[PDB]
């Protein structure tokens, strides 16, 4: 008594969404935002998929051969909401939603009484360099983030585990690089 | 914290069950009827061959993989 | 003429490949062609089980009300291939097979003798910093690249259509910040 | 510049075929068609008040968005 024509339909809706989310661009903020959206909802369609061939082959009696297939699919997929478990509360430790919007493996942030910037970054390095200028922004790596308050003395790169701590060292204005209206701040890692 | 007791639980059942002798001799028959099945009718001889010579293979080097589930939670992103 | 269980064992992969990818990390190289490779495996399930279920609904002569649909996926895939068909291309501009493994915007590269140095970037900025140290090794963004020959004086990023060249101005040493063992150096963009 | 001139073409061959008044009646009847076999028993005033209402709305913003084919395909990264 389940129709078929869901089966169908489910995976038709989760070609779409895989065939749309490869190629959204992840420019401005708002693509991330519909790539991010674009990606749950086929997640959400992914689950209904499997769950209703689960209830198809449980239906006709063909799930033995396939059962440990299903039960890996349902182990990554714990997984996977395990790691959006992280992101989300990944997010909470920044009060940014920057976290889910990107992927990276690590969130430079820095709060203050305006805002709190979270800016993405790749791995621990022993030193990071923070752009700020051209109204004006702040910049790591070629990813931006808007220009609210001042900077501060000591940054933290957040994974979900580790916490590294920055350190402003050095500052690098106009007069020493010849990089018109442009500065650079210079963090080293504290032991 | 959390996550990593409930990853290195997982690890470590998964270790202890396949510790189990007729665990090989399951995954052995599962070889042979992935080749049965097949159309292609060299499979026969491929899994003889190389199956039966590197399945002890593959089950000990899980043994040793699964000596360290930190390494493994870790890689999963679910630990250090 | 055709067997369905084809469709549920395709959908089954596809649900497996899923979810193997986004539980993937991105830290290290091997990591990174792994999860390029599972995503190629993924499109090819995805192309797979889409032209099986359009032979299906075409067995049956259901094809007429989603007709329509099954063009967009095929479109959009088609935009997808032609995406590929520039990283690939892309590759061959910078020699490196970086912009297959990374999804980055753009990629900074520069040529020497002895290596091919391109490391992703997020942005087109009107300053980039490259921190050479800690053996030493390249890294921008906490994108790192292994250190085989020296710097160049003109570095450029590659975008598939965009190429811009930048200049380097200064270099900071380890005696003008105080951080050991590390070196700066500030390229501005040429206009 | 070779994805451009497909990509521009596509895009105004779209807006050439759209720009037919039947379109409108075959997207209107669709969209009527959408809701009819929908299990909501209050999709019928929900699609003849918002889309009866709003499709001409959509149907000029694409009019809007075909007439800069360069800025669409900018936006899907085939063009500058």
Redesign the interface.
């Known amino acids: 008594s389940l129709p078929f024509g869901w089966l169908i339909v489910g995976v038709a809706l989760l070609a779409v969404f895989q065939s749309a989310s490869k190629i959204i661009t992840l420019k401005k903020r708002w693509q991330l935002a519909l790539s991010k959206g674009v990606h749950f909802v086929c997640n959400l369609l992914l689950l209904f998929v499997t769950v209703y061939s689960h209830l198809l082959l449980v239906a006709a009696g063909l799930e033995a051969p396939f059962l440990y297939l299903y039960a890996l699919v349902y182990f990554l997929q714990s997984?996977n909401f395990?790691?959006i478990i992280?992101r989300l509360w990944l997010c909470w430790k920044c009060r940014s939603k920057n976290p889910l919007l990107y992927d990276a493996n690590y969130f430079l942030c820095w709060h203050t009484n305006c805002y709190d910037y979270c800016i993405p970054y790749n791995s621990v390095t022993s030193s990071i360099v923070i752009t700020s200028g051209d109204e004006h922004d702040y910049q790591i790596g070629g990813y931006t983030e808007k220009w609210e308050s001042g900077v501060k003395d000591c940054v933290v790169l957040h994974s979900?585990?580790?916490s590294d701590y920055y350190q402003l060292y050095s500052t690098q204005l106009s007069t020493d690089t010849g990089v018109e209206h442009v500065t650079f701040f210079i963090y080293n890692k504290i032991v | 914290s959390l996550?990593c007791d409930i990853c290195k639980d997982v690890v470590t059942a998964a270790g202890d069950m396949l510790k189990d002798n007729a665990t090989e001799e399951e995954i052995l028959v599962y070889l042979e009827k992935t080749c049965d099945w097949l159309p292609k009718p060299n499979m026969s001889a491929s899994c003889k061959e190389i199956v039966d010579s590197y399945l002890p293979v593959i089950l000990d080097i899980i043994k040793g993989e699964m000596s360290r589930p930190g390494e493994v939670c870790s890689?999963?992103?679910?630990?250090?």
Chains 1, 3 share one sequence.
Do not use: G, H, K
Request: with cysteine.
């Open positions: 997984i395990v790691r992280m979900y585990f580790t | 996550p890689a999963l992103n679910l630990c250090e």
